[PDB]
Every structure is written in C-alpha cells, then in structure tokens.
Amino acid sequence: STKNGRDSNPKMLGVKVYGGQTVTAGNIIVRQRGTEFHAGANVGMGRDHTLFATADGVVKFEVKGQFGRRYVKVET
Amino acid sequence: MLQPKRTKFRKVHKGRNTGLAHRGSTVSFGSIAIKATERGRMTARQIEAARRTISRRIKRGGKIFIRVFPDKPITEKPLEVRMGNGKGNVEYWVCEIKPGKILYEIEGVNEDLAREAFALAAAKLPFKTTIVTRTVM
Amino acid sequence: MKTIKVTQTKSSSHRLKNHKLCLQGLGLRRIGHTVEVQDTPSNRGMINKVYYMVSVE
Amino acid sequence: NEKKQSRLRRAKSTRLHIRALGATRLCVNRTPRHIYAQVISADGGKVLAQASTLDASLRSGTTGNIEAATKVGALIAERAKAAGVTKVAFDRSGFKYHGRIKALADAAREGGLEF
Amino acid sequence: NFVLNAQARAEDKQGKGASRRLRRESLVPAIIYGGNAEPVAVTLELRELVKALESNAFFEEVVEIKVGDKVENVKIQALQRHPAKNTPMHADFKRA
RNA sequence: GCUGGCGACCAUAGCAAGAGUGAACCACCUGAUCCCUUCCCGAACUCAGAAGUGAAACCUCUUAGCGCUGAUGGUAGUGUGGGAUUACCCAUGUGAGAGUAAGUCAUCGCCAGCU
RNA sequence: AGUAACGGAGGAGUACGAAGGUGCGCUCAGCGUGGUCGGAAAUCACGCGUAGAGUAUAAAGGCAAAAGCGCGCUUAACUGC
RNA sequence: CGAAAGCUAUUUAGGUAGCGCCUCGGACGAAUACCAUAGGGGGUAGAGCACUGUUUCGGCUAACCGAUGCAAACUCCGAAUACCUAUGAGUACUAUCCGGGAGACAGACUGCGGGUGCUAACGUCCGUAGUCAAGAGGAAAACAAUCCAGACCGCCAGCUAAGGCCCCAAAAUCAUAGUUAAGUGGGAAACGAUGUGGGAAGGCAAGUCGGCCUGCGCGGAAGAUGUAACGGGG
Numbered sequence: 059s060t061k062n063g064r065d066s067n068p069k070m071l072g073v074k075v076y077g078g079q080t081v082t083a084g085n086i087i088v089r090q091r092g093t094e095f096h097a098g099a100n101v102g103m104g105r106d107h108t109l110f111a112t113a114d115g116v117v118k119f120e121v122k123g124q125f126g127r128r129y130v131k132v133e134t
Numbered sequence: 135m136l137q138p139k140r141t142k143f144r145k146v147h148k149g150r151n152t153g154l155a156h157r158g159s160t161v162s163f164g165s166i167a168i169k170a171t172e173r174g175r176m177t178a179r180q181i182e183a184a185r186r187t188i189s190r191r192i193k194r195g196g197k198i199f200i201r202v203f204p205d206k207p208i209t210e211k212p213l214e215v216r217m218g219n220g221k222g223n224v225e226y227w228v229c230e231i232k233p234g235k236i237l238y239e240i241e242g243v244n245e246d247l248a249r250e251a252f253a254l255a256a257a258k259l260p261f262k263t264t265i266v267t268r269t270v271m
Numbered sequence: 272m273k274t275i276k277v278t279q280t281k282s283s284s285h286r287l288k289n290h291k292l293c294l295q296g297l298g299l300r301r302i303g304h305t306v307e308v309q310d311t312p313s314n315r316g317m318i319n320k321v322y323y324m325v326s327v328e
Numbered sequence: 329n330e331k332k333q334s335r336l337r338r339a340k341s342t343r344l345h346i347r348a349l350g351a352t353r354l355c356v357n358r359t360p361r362h363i364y365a366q367v368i369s370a371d372g373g374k375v376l377a378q379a380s381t382l383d384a385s386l387r388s389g390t391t392g393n394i395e396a397a398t399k400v401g402a403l404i405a406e407r408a409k410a411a412g413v414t415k416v417a418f419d420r421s422g423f424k425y426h427g428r429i430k431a432l433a434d435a436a437r438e439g440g441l442e443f
Numbered sequence: 444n445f446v447l448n449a450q451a452r453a454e455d456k457q458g459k460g461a462s463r464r465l466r467r468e469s470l471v472p473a474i475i476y477g478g479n480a481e482p483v484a485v486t487l488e489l490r491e492l493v494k495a496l497e498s499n500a501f502f503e504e505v506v507e508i509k510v511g512d513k514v515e516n517v518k519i520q521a522l523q524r525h526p527a528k529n530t531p532m533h534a535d536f537k538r539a
Numbered sequence: 540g541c542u543g544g545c546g547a548c549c550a551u552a553g554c555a556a557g558a559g560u561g562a563a564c565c566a567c568c569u570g571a572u573c574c575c576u577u578c579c580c581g582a583a584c585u586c587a588g589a590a591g592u593g594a595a596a597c598c599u600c601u602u603a604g605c606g607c608u609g610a611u612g613g614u615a616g617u618g619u620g621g622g623a624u625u626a627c628c629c630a631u632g633u634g635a636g637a638g639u640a641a642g643u644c645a646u647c648g649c650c651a652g653c654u
Numbered sequence: 655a656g657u658a659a660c661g662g663a664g665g666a667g668u669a670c671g672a673a674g675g676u677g678c679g680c681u682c683a684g685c686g687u688g689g690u691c692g693g694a695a696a697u698c699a700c701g702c703g704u705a706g707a708g709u710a711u712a713a714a715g716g717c718a719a720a721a722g723c724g725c726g727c728u729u730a731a732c733u734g735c
Numbered sequence: 736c737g738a739a740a741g742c743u744a745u746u747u748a749g750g751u752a753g754c755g756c757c758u759c760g761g762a763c764g765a766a767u768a769c770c771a772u773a774g775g776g777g778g779u780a781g782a783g784c785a786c787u788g789u790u791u792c793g794g795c796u797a798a799c800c801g802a803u804g805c806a807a808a809c810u811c812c813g814a815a816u817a818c819c820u821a822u823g824a825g826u827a828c829u830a831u832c833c834g835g836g837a838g839a840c841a842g843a844c845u846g847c848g849g850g851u852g853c854u855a856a857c858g859u860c861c862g863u864a865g866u867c868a869a870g871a872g873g874a875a876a877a878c879a880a881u882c883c884a885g886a887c888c889g890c891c892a893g894c895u896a897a898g899g900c901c902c903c904a905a906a907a908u909c910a911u912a913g914u915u916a917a918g919u920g921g922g923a924a925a926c927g928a929u930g931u932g933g934g935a936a937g938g939c940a941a942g943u944c945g946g947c948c949u950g951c952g953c954g955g956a957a958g959a960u961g962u963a964a965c966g967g968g969g
C-alpha cells in the first residue's frame with residue numbers, strides 16, 4: 059500500500075470566448091486562477107479573477123503596458 | 135558508482151529515448167574521445183567499470199573526463215509480486231544515451247595508447263561506440 | 272468557370288472522417304466515379320486533403 | 329528624482345482609476361514657484377483646456393502661494409466651461425489634497441466645474 | 444590555396460526533403476553571406492569539402508568558391524556535422 | 540533651439556562610460572510664525588519665500604563594451620499517404636529553438652512657456 | 655475543455671469583528687561597507703538591489719493601482735433583486 | 736433503418752437510473768458539415784539553462800566567473816496538429832426542436848501518444864484512429880481485430896485492387912543492368928574474420944602496403960512424436 063491516490067475534480071478553466079467573437083454584456087470570457095489576463099475596456103473582473111464582458115461588442119486580446127500584460131477588451 | 139546527492143523526486147516516468155545527441159557531441163575537454171553511435175541506457179556500474187579499465191590502462195598519465203552522469207532512477211518490483219500495489223523500488227541509476235554522445239574524453243595521452251584504452255572500454259558497454267578526435271570546426 | 276475532372280481511384284471506406292467528408296463534398300460516390308468541379312481554392316483544398324485516393328486531369 | 333519618483337508612484341493609482349472610468353480629468357501640477365492645471369480628455373492625449381501662473385495676468389504678480397492657486401482655479405474653471413467641459417475628475421497627481429491644491433480645486437468648484 | 448567548385452542551389456532544392464535528396468547524392472548545401480551582397484545558396488561536393496576540412500589552413504585562409512564563371516572569396520564560418528556519423532551536413536561562408 | 544506637463548509605444552528605446560545646460564523653467568535651496576505633517580525627526584508631507592548654486596538630481600548629447608533586436612541557410616519536431624519497428628525512412632505540406640551575418644545609444648502626438 | 659490505474663507527490667474537515675470596508679501612506683529579500691556588547695545571521699547609517707521577500711494555511715496560478723505592509727474612521731461579513 | 740460495451744450515481748461493480756449512441760412520428764429547412772480565407776488563446780513535441788533542482792572540469796577565497804550536460808511534477812523560448820468564431824464557393828435531407836419505443840453501460844485487436852511492468856506478456860490502464868463486435872468476398876498456407884474491398888438478385892461477359900505470373904494453381908521459364916554461392920533467400924545479438932562487390936583518400940615504388948565508408952554474404956546458432964524456421968515440389 060502506497061500513499062498516493064488522491065486528486066481533485068476538474069475546474070474547467072480557460073478561455074471561453076476567443077478573439078473576434080461577439081459577446082453580450084455579462085458573457086464570461088476567461089476563467090483563470092490568477093490574472094494571466096487583465097481586464098481592458100468594457101471588461102470586468104470577478105472575485106475569483108473571472109473576466110466578463112460588461113458591454114456588447116467583439117473580444118480583442120492585446121499585449122499592453124510596460125509590464126507586457128495580456129489584456130482582454132471588448133470593442134463596442 | 136555515481137549518483138545524485140539528492141533529487142526533487144524519488145521515482146520517475148519511463149519516457150522514450152528518441153532523437154540524436156546534438157549537444158554533448160563535440161570533443162571539448164581533451165584530445166581524444168569515445169562517442170556512442172547507438173542508443174541506449176548506461177548504468178552507473180557500467181560507467182564505473184569503463185572508467186576503471188581506461189584508467190588502469192593509460193596508467194594515470196593524462197586526465198579522463200567522464201561526460202555522462204547517471205541521474206535517472208530505475209525501479210524494479212521485488213521478485214514474486216503481482217502487478218498492482220504501486221510503483222516498484224529504486225534499484226540503480228542510468229544515463230540516457232543518444233547516438234553522438236561523448237562518454238569519455240582523454241587529455242594528455244598519445245593517440246595509440248588512448249585508442250587501446252578506448253577499445254578496452256568499449257567491451258564493457260551495451261552500445262556500439264567510435265573513437266573521435268578533436269577538430270576545429 | 273474553368274472546371275477540372277476528378278476521379279476516385281481508391282476506397283473511401285476506412286479513411287478519416289474528414290477525408291470522407293471531403294470526398295462527399297466534392298461529389299464523388301464510388302471508386303471510378305468521375306465528377307467535374309469548378310477550379311477554386313475551396314475545391315482545391317478538398318482535393319489536396321485526399322490527393323492519395325483521387326486522380327485529377 | 330526620489331521625490332518625483334515616489335510622487336508619480338502615488339499618482340498612478342488615481343490616474344489608472346480615472347482612465348478606467350473614462351472621464352475628463354483635471355490634472356494639477358505644483359512646483360515651489362508655480363502651479364498648473366490641465367483639463368485633459370478621457371483618452372489622455374488631448375488637452376481640452378489649461379491654466380497656470382504663467383498667463384500675463386498672474387506672472388507679473390507673485391506665484392506659488394494659496395492666492396495665486398485660487399486665481400488659477402478660477403481661470404481654469406472659466407476656460408474649461410468655454411470648451412464645454414463640466415464634469416471632471418480631480419487628479420491631485422500625488423500631491424496631498426490639502427493646501428494650494430485644495431485652493432485650486434475650491435476655486436474650480438465655485439467657477440462651475442462639477443466634481 | 445583552396446578552391447571549391449559549387450553549383451547554384453535554387454529554391455525547390457531548399458527545405459528538408461530537397462536537402463536530404465542532395466545529401467543522398469553526395470552533396471552538401473551551403474550558404475554565403477557577408478559584405479553587402481545578399482546570401483547565395485550553393486551545392487558543394489562532399490569529397491572536395493571533406494578533403495579540404497582535413498587541413499588547418501582551410502580554417503585560417505581565404506578560400507574561393509566558383510558557382511560557375513563567378514569567383515567568390517570567402518572564409519568558412521560554420522560547419523554542421525551529422526551527430527553520429529561525423530559527415531558534414533551544411534557549411535556557412537562569410538564573404539572575404 | 541530649449542524647457543515643463545499629459546499621452547502613444549514598452550529595451551532597435553536599456554545599462555555602462557564619458558560631456559554639457561541656469562534667460563526662463565526645473566531642481567537643490569532659506570525658514571517654519573500660520574494651515575498641515577513625524578509610531579522620534581520640517582527627512583518626507585505642508586506652508587511662507589527668493590540670498591545663492593547647477594554641486595547633487597533631472598534633462599540633453601556622444602560611445603556597440605554589455606544587454607536587446609535579428610535574418611539567410613541548415614537542423615530538430617510535425618499533419619496526411621506509404622514503408623519499416625526501437626523511433627526511423629520516403630512523397631507532399633509545415634517548420635523551430637539555439638547559433639551566425641547584421642541592426643540598435645528610439646519614434647510619435649496634444650498643450651503651455653521661454654528664447 | 656475532459657481523460658484511468660492498489661500511477662507519482664502533497665494538503666483539507668479551519669481561521670479572522672479584524673486578518674472585513676474605505677481613505678491616506680509605505681516597499682521588500684538579499685548583498686557590501688561602517689558601528690556598545692553584537693558574533694556568519696538582531697537593531698542603526700550609507701550604497702547597490704537582477705523579484706530571489708511576503709501572502710492565516712498545501713500547491714499552482716497571481717500580486718505595483720501591489721493582492722504584500724501600516725495608520726484614521728468604520729460595519730457593504732447589508733436587505734430586495 | 737440500425738447501436739453500445741461510455742460518463743455520472745448507486746450496500747454499486749455480471750443489476751439499475753439520467754445523459755451519450757439507435758429508431759419512428761411531427762415541426763422547421765440550410766440554421767449544419769466538409770474546404771478556402773480571416774481572426775484567436777495556448778505551453779505540448781522540439782529546444783534551452785533565464786528560474787528551481789541536478790551535474791563535470793578549470794579559475795578565484797564558499798559565493799562568483801569561463802567552459803560543459805540533464806529534467807513528468809524546471810522554462811528565457813516554442814511548433815505541427817487540434818479547438819473556437821466570422822465570411823464565402825460547391826457538394827450533401829444536414830442541423831435543431833417537440834413526442835412514442837428501445838437496446839446498451841463484460842468489449843477485443845492493430846497503429847500512433849503515454850502511465851505501469853522487465854522500454855515482458857494474446858498483460859494492464861488511459862487518449863486517438865481503424866477494424867471486429869454487427870461484415871461476406873480477394874491476399875497473408877491455414878489465420879475475428881492485418882492489407883485490398885463494403886455482398887439487392889441473375890449471367891459459361893469485360894476492366895481492375897491488394898497480391899501475384901516454373902509446377903501443385905490463373906497469369907512472364909518476359910526484358911535490360913547489377914549482386915549473392917550462404918539454399919543466404921526461407922528465424923536471432925555482442926563480438927570475430929585477406930568472403931565478395933563498390934566509393935573516397937593515403938603511404939612506398941614489378942606493383943605493393945593497411946586505414947576508413949558502404950552493398951550482399953559467413954561464424955556466433957543446442958531439445959525433446961516426424962523432415963518440421965520457403966505451404967510443398969523444386
């Protein structure tokens with residue numbers, strides 16, 4: 059008998075809406091543990107770092123700033 | 135026989151030994167080298183045996199550079215146990231050998247004595263080898 | 272416009288799902304069947320996917 | 329250097345929040361000798377209005393005290409209303425809100441600027 | 444003095460498959476760059492090159508390549524050898 | 540031609556090394572009575588100023604030494620079809636990382652002031 | 655995205671009225687050089703400082719508008735949704 | 736017309752239930768798929784040593800520096816594919832939705848990517864494709880799961896696939912140029928050797944010497960009813 063048999067249930071994280079797709083307000087874009095993506099314009103962040111669309115438009119990923127951050131934003 | 139002083143993990147996946155050795159394939163420490171032209175595993179016992187037969191032959195003149203180090207642990211199930219009940223116990227350590235890998239290098243010895251020593255070492259190893267010399271590009 | 276002739280030369284039965292769909296989307300039904308298709312990039316892609324079981328004029 | 333470096337670190341938070349709100353910004357700067365106010369667009373690139381102690385109406389006097397700051401606040405309020413700018417967000421730019429900055433901001437509130 | 448005789452290597456002789464075909468017919472792909480001209484791709488003969496490689500002046504001298512009625516004064520810049528069998532796979536030449 | 544502020548852009552823009560700027564501006568500066576500060580301290584923050592100094596700092600120039608960027612070619616890997624089974628080969632498509640030549644001592648915008 | 659094994663490794667069955675909210679402020683870890691014990695390693699000063707510190711707690715992913723560290727006032731640790 | 740041997744749960748594991756997969760009816764009809772183009776996010780293969788570990792040599796007074804390797808639980812990098820969305824040509828009763836009836840929830844093998852095992856097993860456990868299951872025909876002597884191919888019925892018609900063409904047994908004792916002498920072909924390793932063919936060099940001068948790289952062969956090679964490791968003759 060060994061001491062390794064455990065694991066947790068899957069969490070289904072990841073990008074839910076890719077670049078160029080249309081969203082409505084409230085649509086979830088990214089499920090992430092930390093902020094590997096940061097909220098740009100028309101994108102909000104939930105308590106578990108979920109990125110969601112706060113407006114209609116199309117999704118657009120970028121690399122911005124001097125920290126080279128990945129940003130999600132919604133174009134209206 | 136060589137062994138890591140410590141490791142992050144005791145047991146390791148089997149893996150696949152595939153591809154060519156493009157990294158450790160150039161004579162860099164000495165003047166003559168033995169190079170594996172075939173693929174396989176090199177246990178620490180084989181490394182010790184080949185080093186002993188080379189060093190006893192060249193009679194301590196010149197330096198020997200061991201370019202392989204056994205850092206992969208290999209497990210085995212004890213005799214007369216069935217197929218479940220977790221992973222077997224570590225027995226020995228191996229280095230993975232891709233064709234083109236330098237195993238031993240000799241510095242400070244003429245070519246003929248070193249070739250005798252390398253022929254003596256080749257009969258202790260499980261893959262085909264070759265004797266290569268240092269070039270300039 | 273600028274048609275080409277496409278004949279099926281091998282079987283489509285045990286191929287990948289999308290290779291069979293490329294054959295069906297070209298209009299080919301059986302071994303030895305010949306169809307006349309417009310020469311376009313959209314059709315050249317389907318033909319290139321299944322180059323090995325098809326012959327082109 | 330160290331002072332300016334730390335003050336810009338202090339200003340970054342309010343600046344990023346104002347940019348996220350998408351608001352017209354009244355950015356102020358204060359030196360030991362002068363004071364400046366700029367009404368800047370939401371994109372952060374266009375200066376919609378400005379005022380300072382270098383205006384041929386405050387320079388000839390004395391600058392760098394609370395009275396000159398009140399005068400600058402009145403002037404920027406007028407010039408900003410002239411360009412159709414009413415609702416702004418005040419950017420103290422790492423300066424404490426009390427003092428000369430507060431005098432400028434109060435003169436701007438009384439001038440008609442809404443914040 | 445070393446003189447290597449080369450042929451031009453156009454595209455459709457470049458890439459993985461064509462390079463392997465060349466090396467099967469006892470040829471070596473090579474490239475020449477430096478100066479202000481553009482890189483030129485060439486095919487060398489393997490025996491000529493492995494013979495020149497035995498000498499040491501070949502690595503310290505200005506050697507000459509003839510793509511056909513064109514002189515090229517170069518120096519060897521980089522060699523690529525097959526890892527297991529020591530045969531050279533590709534050569535780099537810097538215009539001199 | 541110079542400063543100031545706010546941005547775009549995030550090293551081809553940086554480090555390191557030299558060099559220069561005081562009309563104005565900016566910085567250092569003088570003192571804290573007053574408003575404000577200090578788990579002690581006018582260091583910082585804040586206020587009242589203008590006797591000095593560009594010393595420091597900022598800013599601007601110059602320099603490939605290091606960084607950073609970076610081909611071409613080749614190699615590794617790989618989708619499909621085929622052939623072999625120790626991981627390859629062939630046809631076709633794709634094609635790195637590393638390294639080499641080389642390039643870099645930024646480019647741009649709105650506003651204000653001074654020459 | 656999901657994905658099994660008596661596969662390889664580790665944690666949980668809590669804590670906290672502040673360790674929550676907010677406004678304001680702050681920036682480590684390590685090095686060198688000096689200084690009463692005091693010393694490799696305490697506190698002080700000065701120079702660097704490549705993120706290597708920290709995070710109630712395991713690991714991963716995050717963390718400069720710091721998500722890390724302080725001070726004031728507070729109850730949004732609200733009700734209907 | 737036509738499955739499944741899956742997932743989730745279960746005193747559950749050879750039972751059952753919901754979903755997945757089948758069929759019938761109705762509604763609605765390109766919403767769907769294939770391919771092209773466009774737009775996306777990856778952290779795998781490979782690579783690398785910038786972090787965490789590990790590792791060899793050398794310098795320096797242990798840290799650092801130069802050189803040098805390695806990694807499922809390392810990453811300064813980083814594909815092909817796959818996946819998501821939009822637009823478009825052509826070709827396909829496609830896709831959805833509402834009801835009736837199910838069966839099934841023991842799977843197997845082959846390839847590819849893996850864990851485990853001895854880089855054992857017609858082993859075991861996953862992912863992915865095909866086949867069988869539920870699929871006949873031709874080839875592989877015989878031979879579910881390999882290769883070619885999807886049987887509506889009939890025919891003393893023709894063309895072909897895989898595979899073949901001396902005879903058993905349908906079709907070349909066909910053609911051209913080479914290699915092998917071992918019946919190798921028609922079972923096997925480290926290693927051993929003036930076998931024999933070819934290639935690029937080299938040394939010494941009636942040519943000779945010994946080094947490589949390769950094609951095909953040789954030894955290494957011992958089992959129990961009877962040749963018996965080309966299906967046979969040959």
Ligand SMILES: C[NH+](C)c1cc(NC(=O)CNC(C)(C)C)c(O)c2c1C[C@H]1C[C@H]3[C@H]([NH+](C)C)C(O)=C(C(N)=O)C(=O)[C@@]3(O)C(O)=C1C2=O
Nearest residue numbers: 123124125126127548549550552553598607645704705718
């Ligand atoms: C474009 N780069 C060259 C740049 C420019 C400026 N300058 C400005 O924008 C303002 N001043 C200028 C415009 C140059 C006159 C910059 O101010 C900066 C930087 C670089 C960043 C890099 C930062 C980085 N991390 C935090 C994303 C980092 O890891 C380091 C580091 N040494 O490891 C940094 O130094 C960094 O934090 C940093 O400080 C940067 C800048 O400050």
Ligand SMILES: C[NH+](C)c1cc(NC(=O)CNC(C)(C)C)c(O)c2c1C[C@H]1C[C@H]3[C@H]([NH+](C)C)C(O)=C(C(N)=O)C(=O)[C@@]3(O)C(O)=C1C2=O
Nearest residue numbers: 124125126127128333681682702703704705716717718720
């Ligand atoms: C804390 N911030 C203000 C900071 C400051 C400096 N530099 C200084 O402190 C300057 N040193 C002085 C005191 C001026 C001599 C910094 O140098 C840095 C950083 C931030 C870190 C952030 C790192 C980060 N992860 C690993 C925690 C990260 O993922 C990134 C990134 N771009 O994704 C980083 O850049 C980061 O690795 C990094 O390099 C930082 C700094 O270098």
Ligand SMILES: C[NH+](C)c1cc(NC(=O)CNC(C)(C)C)c(O)c2c1C[C@H]1C[C@H]3[C@H]([NH+](C)C)C(O)=C(C(N)=O)C(=O)[C@@]3(O)C(O)=C1C2=O
Nearest residue numbers: 124329332333334336337549550552553554606607704785
């Ligand atoms: C270009 N970035 C990525 C960079 C890289 C390095 N290099 C390293 O730290 C290398 N260290 C290794 C060995 C790689 C671990 C760097 O060392 C630096 C920087 C950024 C500069 C920016 C400097 C800047 N200028 C205008 C003075 C500046 O004003 C700031 C600022 N306002 O924060 C800086 O941080 C800056 O002074 C600075 O410190 C930089 C670096 O040190």
Ligand SMILES: [Mg+2]
Nearest residue numbers: 094125126127
């Ligand atoms: Mg990061």
Ligand SMILES: [Mg+2]
Nearest residue numbers: 338341679719
């Ligand atoms: Mg703050």
Ligand SMILES: [Mg+2]
Nearest residue numbers: 459460630631
């Ligand atoms: Mg290929």
Ligand SMILES: [Mg+2]
Nearest residue numbers: 611612613634
């Ligand atoms: Mg390339």
Ligand SMILES: [Mg+2]
Nearest residue numbers: 610635636637
């Ligand atoms: Mg590249």
Ligand SMILES: [Mg+2]
Nearest residue numbers: 125704705785
């Ligand atoms: Mg950094």
Ligand SMILES: [Mg+2]
Nearest residue numbers: 736737869885
């Ligand atoms: Mg049917």
Ligand SMILES: [Mg+2]
Nearest residue numbers: 759760761762
């Ligand atoms: Mg229907």
Ligand SMILES: [Mg+2]
Nearest residue numbers: 780781782806
């Ligand atoms: Mg790998």
Ligand SMILES: [Mg+2]
Nearest residue numbers: 748749750840
């Ligand atoms: Mg069951």
Ligand SMILES: [Mg+2]
Nearest residue numbers: 740741840841
């Ligand atoms: Mg079952």
Ligand SMILES: [Mg+2]
Nearest residue numbers: 842843860861
């Ligand atoms: Mg199964």
Ligand SMILES: [Mg+2]
Nearest residue numbers: 843857858859
């Ligand atoms: Mg089985």
